[PDB]
């Protein structure tokens, strides 16, 4: 079936994994090194035996391909994902006045009395940012995003580089090349941000009429993240795929460090007495091809049968 | 066995491969997507079946080290195996008088007669660069090679970064950061390289106490490459896991692309008729311990017992 390969992935962080310790101070269970991989012609990855938001895989891919680093886009889609980002910065700038947060996204969820201060000044940032336009431009910014690694690399002589763009120009005229990479790992800019990059690299690869996608992520969370992740990119594998006019091979996902959090182990332990049911169906909008200028309505998910949502923790 | 992990990469391109076209003429059987695993507490992971020259693996990681560029420092030790890039620039330049050896590295394979003006200059070169203090600085550096990826990384702020150096300190203060990372993958000097790095990034992980490094090479030639580049490695994880006092974990080794070329079948064919034999081990000096200034002595491959070396040519 097709997601069993992630299923597996859990069973052996849980019955073959090593305790270790982490930034975030809950615990993990971690392994190192592995792949799994999934054959697109086969279906859609994105899981049955739990529900996943497509529309927050979606509306967040999109963002990334016009190059955008505005949580407005997101905020205009009713996605949330990347606020605790932008807020925490706006948090720590005397322009803000009031309830100095300090670790906000840490004592409100073992605080229900700050839960409400906390949630309170979040639809004031929000609401700011997609109200007022000099907010949007100055806090609503968050810069160093895989919007910007892919679409805009600084360089040391001033200019911006279209690290996606131009591999998909690659694809076209060099389909047997082997040096179709883009990465979002920058050596200088490493040090200076909230959280370098889990998703570091990507290669494409043109096997006999279909692509291919790797993808080497340093650091996973098998329940909350590998989920939303393998979808993010079976379904970038289809637009490009789709622009460059190609059948779809496989997503090959490898990673260096997957973990699975301590008060994570239930609920995985409770998802694997599902048995997966067959996968959805991509659709993509036969008539526009310029991938960069997709919007929502161009992607439908067909045929998506999941079971019940999991509710889970965010370990901080 | 150490090394089957290896044998079954070769047999899986051979009896479950996909022909392909490339850059060098020759044609190939590829792959997408591999993983493969050593346990360096085992073993190193040299070769048995095949004869390779820990000599060259050895005098070309400690070049890297030093953060070196020079051919100069290979030469010194009879390592040529960076000549054709260094010559190949000589050779266009109008200080080069002569012969215009365009395409030098191709009918000289063809061609016996031309296989001796070739090799004259070359040991012109190769001589000059060992003599010639001002030719050796002008000719001899390479300028963007592993070894300046990996300890003068240029910023957009005119300075050098020492990301090998660095992650390093980490691993001391931070056993368990999972952003241990160096990678040679540059976006903006990647479109004007004769070669963009082969061995892409890599990613030291601590467990209970033993240190593990996984690489990512997006192309890879199982029988001339592979072979090198498995003890390059292996040897790396070693010589960290000395100066940071941690015992040794494993190798992880990942392909994007990974080819056997056509005129090698026979060969790797042939080489697949051996059976293993037990590995070597690496025995260094005890009393050093700040491995940027490590020196050949400071190395021993003791037990090594090697099947003949098989002669293979260069496809290009
Ligand atoms: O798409 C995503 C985003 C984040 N994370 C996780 C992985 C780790 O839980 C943490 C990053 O680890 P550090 O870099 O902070 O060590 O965020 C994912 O798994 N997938
Ligand atoms: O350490 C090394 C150096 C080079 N190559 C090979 C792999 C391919 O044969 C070629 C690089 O492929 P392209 O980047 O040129 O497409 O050089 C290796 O396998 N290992």
Known sequence: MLEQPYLDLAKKVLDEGHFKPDRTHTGTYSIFGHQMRFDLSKGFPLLT??????????????????????????????????????????????????????????????????????????????????????????????????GSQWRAWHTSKGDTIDQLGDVIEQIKTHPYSRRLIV??????????????????????????????????????????????????????????????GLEVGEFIHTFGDAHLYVNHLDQIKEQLSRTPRPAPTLQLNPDKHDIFDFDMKDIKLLNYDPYPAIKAPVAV
């Not at 229900?112 to 000099?134: G, I, N, Q, S, T």
């Not at 992520?217 to 993240?225: E, T, V």
């Open 183 to 244: 990465s979002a790992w920058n050596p200088e800019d490493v040090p200076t941000m909230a959280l370098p990059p889990c998703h570091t690299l990507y290669q494409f690869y043109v096997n006999d009429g279909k692509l291919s996608l790797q993808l080497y992520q340093r650091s996973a969370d098998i329940f909350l993240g590998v989920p939303f992740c393998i979808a993010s990119y079976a379904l970038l594998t289809h637009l490009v795929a789709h622009e460059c």
């Open 49 to 146: 035996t739990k529900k996943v938001p497509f529309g927050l895989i979606k509306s967040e891919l999109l963002w990334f391909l016009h190059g955008d680093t505005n949580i407005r886009f997101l905020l205009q889609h009713r996605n949330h994902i990347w606020d605790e980002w932008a807020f925490e910065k706006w948090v720590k700038s005397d322009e803000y006045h009031g309830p100095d947060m300090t670790d906000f996204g840490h004592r409100s969820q073992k605080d229900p009395e700050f839960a409400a201060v906390y949630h309170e000044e979040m639809a004031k940032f929000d609401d700011r940012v997609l109200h007022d336009d000099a907010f949007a431009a100055k806090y609503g910014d968050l810069g160093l995003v895989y």
